[PDB]
Structure 1
Amino acid sequence: GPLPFGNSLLKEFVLDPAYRNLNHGSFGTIPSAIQQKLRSYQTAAEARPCPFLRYQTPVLLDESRAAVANLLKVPVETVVFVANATMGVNTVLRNIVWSADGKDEILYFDTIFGACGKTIDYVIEDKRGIVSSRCIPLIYPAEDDDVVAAFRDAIKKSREEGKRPRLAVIDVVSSMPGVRFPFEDIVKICKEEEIISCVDGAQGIGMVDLKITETDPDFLISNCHKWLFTPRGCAVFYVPVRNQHLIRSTLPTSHGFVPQKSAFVSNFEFVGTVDNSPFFCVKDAIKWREEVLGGEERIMEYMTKLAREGGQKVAEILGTRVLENSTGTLIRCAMVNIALPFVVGEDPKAPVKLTEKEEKDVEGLYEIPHEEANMAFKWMYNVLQDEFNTFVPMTFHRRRFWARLSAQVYLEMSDFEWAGKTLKELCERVAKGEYK
């Protein structure tokens, strides 16, 4: 039968027993059964290179394409594997041909992943101004209605400047901070307004239900290596059949390109020589998660609940609060943010008008001068690795540090309590000016 969750499940993984993994959402990790699968695929590749790599690669790709589309509840003709989420997002933006009038505009939110945000910048530079972009600022904790309204005002405002809102990139779950984004509402608005919905669901498969069919996005990308126990360097790229014709070239351009099984699926089979073993392990990771663990829903059910209750314990230990809106829809994933018990001094260049609640929440804590914010930020990162042998990413949002913790099926309440007590003393030492 299935195995119980918690620290006993560390038996199945290959983490350092001295190292606490509180940040699975960044790079992921794989259990011992999947690494051996990974290395098994390599031995076959090095045993007879041309026979295996030329003819067994498409068979092993389609076995994982079938398993992942199955689990996503979508046709197999619509899923394909790319290197990673940054690669997939780049594949969408680099392939779109923009209107000849030059009125097209890319809409995005300021919680966009750094790599994604800078891809929009370069594409605008590369196409030399035939497409532009407008940034939608977000204040967190964000109410879902405020996010969708800020998107509607961006659509309305863009048209008042003579611009055409052409494409919108929507997170499933944002990176920093790790919050569930109301992507269903934003994608639906994109359809009504005829906007290409480029759903960046890197924090997606294996953690939250993507609801691909009912949402019907134009493009979706998601990192299997982030929450599906898939070896590093694997993202599932979803393109409906109606849109596969605009993905004209892969990244990079390879043999499958035709100058002007489907041709769309075949073009991604060989895109330059790479170790494709992480792709082949998708079918095993899915089968391992269903047989060894209780299944996909049981995995997500535990991680989300542990993120709530575990995050609330870190907040009690710190005397602060988790990051959540009035409807409790931000912590609908496996990650949770907790505010740290201090505050940064005001930036005279870009001062943030603090909200009355955010100011009473500052309640006379220790204040780090803004000139020392980056210095203390580096210190907390190094100390968490060198002294506590863990790693906690922190979002600097409105002169506060929001530490993001990632729950997993091999963690339990004791880990988040250790995380709370660790962060507690770490901030006590930040309060004493130890970062200098």
Structure 2
Amino acid sequence: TTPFGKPMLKHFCMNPEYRNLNAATCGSWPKTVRDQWRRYLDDLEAQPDYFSEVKQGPVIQEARREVAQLLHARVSECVFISNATTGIYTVLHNIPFDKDDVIITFSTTYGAIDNAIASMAETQPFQTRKVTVDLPMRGEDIVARFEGMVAQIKAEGLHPRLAVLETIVSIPAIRMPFESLVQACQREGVLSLVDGAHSIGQFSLNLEVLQPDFFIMDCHKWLFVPRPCAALYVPERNQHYIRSTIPPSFGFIPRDPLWSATDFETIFANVATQDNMPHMCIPTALKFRREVCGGEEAIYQYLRVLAKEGGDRVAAILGTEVLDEEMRDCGIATVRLPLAGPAVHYLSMTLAETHKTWLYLIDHGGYIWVRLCAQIYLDTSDFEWIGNVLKEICET
């Protein structure tokens, strides 16, 4: 119905000047989602407990159902969590790790995940190995060091237990060869934890063909919902591992109340207090996306096509290059700044205050890179806007 680009600006709820090149961090939802979001506040403020106890349940069961469809997965294999870090941790914590089990990560693994792994190792006797990845690299050359690491670990007599993988690197943002890495884990006997925080709502995803051991995603990053909102995919063949949430609560299951579906689903049903309304905007966001956006695929292809061109443009104006070896099969472009605390500081100051947009930077190799994010309301003009901005900002 509405052609994408700036013609979609009227469907959303931002300052007309505000340029959102960073939608995934907090989210970006349409009018019909903020409306229905606000429609759920009233029903909470008009009858708190009847909303809570009766009117909340079924809409959540609906939202699960659509997400399970959007992943080509079974609704019984999908549960809702507060944020990604909770889900990944929830999986890690429930796994009984021996002293000979090895957890494999990469130099692209999210820092919070490394910390989570660092912490468990204090009271648990396992160990870890970090597959060195220094982008730009090729998709098969990553899988090369992976099976190189797994074969060494089996040669040392240890047991490659679990491998942490991500769809998109947080920053520097690329699409990792995660399908290939899931496969290598299948043949070797390694469990594949997939941190797909940037995944659903950005590019097509078929968990039925992928068959990932565990799949985490942040709906609030690309599914047009407010933060925090996530979901956890575990296939039935692995639902036995997860016996409790993090933190634990009433759905706990021991290895052997009256005021109160499979055991796995109730674990994530009887949990401490939660705001569920972001999850209850999944239907209205996925209806917007079928009726206004012309279906999921329509959205994905724009996000990929805006990201390709727009990123190459900004690269030129600055005089640098967009990280690449497709690792750019994503609505994200990570562009290098011509720059080899305060400065880094000041740069961001200008964005939020002066150019009411915002970008993320990172320390790499003799240069600082930035993360640009596409979305159906931006246009190639907007990315050329930021490009020229950044060049002057850079130089100043």
TM-score by length of 1: 0.87
Equivalent residues in 2 for 1:202-217, closer than 5 Å: 202-217=197-212
- Counterpart CA distance in 1 for 2:3 and 2:334 is 26
- Counterpart CA distance in 2 for 1:95 and 1:41 is 34
Q: Which of 346, 349, 360 is residue 393 of structure 1 equivalent to?
A: 360
Out of 406-415 and 204-213, give the one that drifted further: 204-213
SS, match of residue 103 in structure 2: strand
- Counterpart CA distance in 2 for 1:132 and 1:68 is 35
- Counterpart CA distance in 2 for 1:34 and 1:114 is 32
Equivalent residues in 2 for 1:34-49, closer than 5 Å: 34-49=33-48
- Equivalent residue for 2:170? 175
- Counterpart CA distance in 1 for 2:57 and 2:290 is 24
- Counterpart CA distance in 2 for 1:236 and 1:284 is 17
**Uncovered stretches (5+) of structure 2, i.e. residues with no partner:** none
Q: Which of 183, 199, 223 is residue 188 of structure 1 equivalent to?
A: 183
- Counterpart CA distance in 1 for 2:377 and 2:359 is 17
Cα deviation for residue 147 of structure 1 reads 0.5
- Counterpart CA distance in 2 for 1:39 and 1:161 is 57
Cα deviation for residue 342 of structure 1 reads 3.0
**Uncovered stretches (5+) of structure 1, i.e. residues with no partner:** 344-373, 430-436
Cα deviation for residue 295 of structure 1 reads 0.9
**8 Å CA contact retained: 2:60, 2:279:** yes
- Equivalent residue for 2:64? 65
Aligned length: 391
SS, match of residue 186 in structure 1: helix
**8 Å CA contact retained: 2:73, 2:206:** no
- What per-residue deviation string (whole Å, max 9, x for no partner) do you get for residues 277-331 of structure 1? 1111112211111112111100010011000000011012112111111xxx111
**8 Å CA contact retained: 2:336, 2:369:** yes
Equivalent residues in 2 for 1:151-170, closer than 5 Å: 151-170=146-165
Out of 130-139 and 157-166, give the one that drifted further: 157-166
- What per-residue deviation string (whole Å, max 9, x for no partner) do you get for residues 250-285 of structure 1? 122122223222121122123111111111111221
- Equivalent residue for 2:107? 110
Cα deviation for residue 121 of structure 1 reads 1.1
- Counterpart CA distance in 2 for 1:43 and 1:30 is 19
- Equivalent residue for 2:233? 238
Out of 167-176 and 114-123, give the one that drifted further: 114-123
- Counterpart CA distance in 2 for 1:21 and 1:53 is 34
TM-score by length of 2: 0.96
- Equivalent residue for 2:377? 410
Out of 141-150 and 21-30, give the one that drifted further: 21-30
Cα deviation for residue 416 of structure 1 reads 0.5
- Counterpart CA distance in 2 for 1:60 and 1:338 is 40
Cα deviation for residue 46 of structure 1 reads 2.7
**8 Å CA contact retained: 1:61, 1:269:** no
Cα deviation for residue 49 of structure 1 reads 2.2
- Equivalent residue for 1:378? 345
**8 Å CA contact retained: 2:70, 2:205:** no
**8 Å CA contact retained: 2:250, 2:271:** yes
- Equivalent residue for 1:29? 28
Cα deviation for residue 69 of structure 1 reads 0.8
SS, match of residue 333 in structure 2: strand
Out of 261-270 and 246-255, give the one that drifted further: 261-270
Q: Which amino acid aligns with 2:116?
A: T
SS, match of residue 237 in structure 2: coil
Q: Which amino acid aligns with 2:246?
A: L
Cα deviation for residue 211 of structure 1 reads 2.4
SS, match of residue 181 in structure 1: coil
Q: Which amino acid aligns with 1:235?
A: A
SS, match of residue 21 in structure 1: coil
Equivalent residues in 2 for 1:26-425, closer than 5 Å: 26-99=25-98, 102-125=99-122, 128-259=123-254, 260=256, 261-325=261-325, 329-343=326-340, 374-425=341-392
**8 Å CA contact retained: 2:24, 2:220:** no
Out of 188-197 and 112-121, give the one that drifted further: 112-121
CA RMSD of aligned residues (A): 1.3
Cα deviation for residue 92 of structure 1 reads 0.5
SS, match of residue 202 in structure 1: coil
- Counterpart CA distance in 2 for 1:269 and 1:42 is 21
Q: Which amino acid aligns with 1:304?
A: R
- Counterpart CA distance in 2 for 1:45 and 1:263 is 29
- What per-residue deviation string (whole Å, max 9, x for no partner) do you get for residues 128-150 of structure 1? 24221111121111111110011
